[PDB]
Amino acid sequence: EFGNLARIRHVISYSLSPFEQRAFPSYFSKGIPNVLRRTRERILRVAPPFVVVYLIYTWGNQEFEQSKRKNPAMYE
């Protein structure tokens, strides 16, 4: 429990009371930049698998259709 969790030394920690500080300091001021900062550090790891899922899904659909489409040469 608390008190026996870990041993740190000389780490001072300042803080403020909730009612004394603005609730949403610069929320959209820096929030947007940060969210954008975040997206650019993770987009290349996340997005291209889902991009090729979209290509495979479309491909499958279209291929399936062509598969279903009657063979004109057949039956003639």
Ligand X SMILES: CCCCCCCCCCCCCCCCCC(=O)OC[C@H](COP(=O)([O-])OCC(O)COP(=O)([O-])OC[C@@H](COC(=O)CCCCCCCCCCCCCCCCC)OC(=O)CCCCCCCCCCCCCCCCC)OC(=O)CCCCCCCCCCCCCCCCC
Where does this chain bind another protein (CB under 8 A)?
1-20
Question: CA 36 to CA 42: how far, in whole Å?
Answer: 10
Nearest distance in Å: CB 15, another protein: 4
- Residue 32 or residue 53: which is nearer to ligand X going by CB? 32
- Residue 35 or residue 52: which is nearer to ligand X going by CB? 35
Question: CA 19 to CA 24: how far, in whole Å?
Answer: 12
Q: Using CB under 6 A, which of the segments 12-20, 26-34, 43-51, 59-67 binds ligand X?
A: 26-34
Element of type H or E holding 17: none
Residue from 13, 35, 14 nearest 26 by CA: 35
Using CB under 6 A as the binding rule, whether residue 32 contacts ligand X is answered as yes
Question: CA 15 to CA 7: how far, in whole Å?
Answer: 20
Using CB under 6 A as the binding rule, whether residue 43 contacts ligand X is answered as no
